[PDB]
Design a protein around this nucleic acid. Sequence first.
DNA 1: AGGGCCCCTTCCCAAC
DNA 2: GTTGGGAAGGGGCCCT
DNA 3: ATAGGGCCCCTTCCCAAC
DNA 4: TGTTGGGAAGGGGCCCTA
Lengths: 111, 112
Amino acid sequence: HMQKCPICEKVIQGAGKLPRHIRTHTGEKPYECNICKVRFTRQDKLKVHMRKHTGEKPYLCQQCGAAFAHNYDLKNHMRVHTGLRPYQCDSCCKTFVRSDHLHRHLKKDGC
Amino acid sequence: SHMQKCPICEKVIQGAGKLPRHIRTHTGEKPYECNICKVRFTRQDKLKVHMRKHTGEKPYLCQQCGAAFAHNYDLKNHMRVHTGLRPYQCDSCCKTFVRSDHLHRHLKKDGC
DNA sequence: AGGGCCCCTTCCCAAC
DNA sequence: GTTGGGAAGGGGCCCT
DNA sequence: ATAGGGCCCCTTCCCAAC
DNA sequence: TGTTGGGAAGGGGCCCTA
Ligand SMILES: [Zn+2]
Ligand SMILES: [Zn+2]
Ligand SMILES: [Zn+2]
Ligand SMILES: [Zn+2]
Ligand SMILES: [Zn+2]
Ligand SMILES: [Zn+2]
Ligand SMILES: [Zn+2]
Ligand SMILES: [Zn+2]
């Protein structure tokens, strides 16, 4: 369930997820694309890469017809139609539409 | 409880008794206050470091020249003039840096 | 218990 | 100054 | 044999000085 | 302009004491 990496000593969660993390140290990339033969450290990244060769964006917006490569990217897009800005800075009260936009504002100062 | 997940951000915090310290990063609580300048701190060890401003203590002394410094990074920087050593080196560039964060922002800033 | 698969985060940087 | 696509990496969840 | 406080180490970060 | 660097923020290991 939880284990420390023998190289970086950071805690890795999830059973069987340690070899995947160690590949970020060793750099080994077992999964290879059948077309461009670019190698990848993880299988889910290679699967996403194969869609780049076809241009497939399977997740479509119901309102504007916009296509996205990831289903969670489509949920981020729905905020354009709903106008919802769920992230807010408790010091400024300024709102954002993505979490990293709020994270960028907090690491600054003078706010 | 050498390892525990924070009840707020669900991230793993290591070390016994280290969770309330991490919780204060969420709440902003500053229970440690310098009684001279009234500046508040979230951690006791950060208060001790701040006390050196008033005591003038420079506990980091060089073993060769004997110069005293207030922070460990001052001594490490000062050791460079005794050595000439630049300790951090990229391998996809063989470019040399003086601090660790200089190498990190070089491996993540376009370029090579 | 470990493999797919997906969700989620920040970082970079460009379009706007 | 705001938005967002791509990518790296971590963790939850399902199934066999 | 153990848990918590103190203490000091390390890192990346912003961003200003050089 | 690029490079250097001071200090903040935060996480983790070691030691001492109960
Ligand atoms: Zn590691
Ligand atoms: Zn390919
Ligand atoms: Zn839409
Ligand atoms: Zn704000
Ligand atoms: Zn937390
Ligand atoms: Zn003070
Ligand atoms: Zn010296
Ligand atoms: Zn390089």
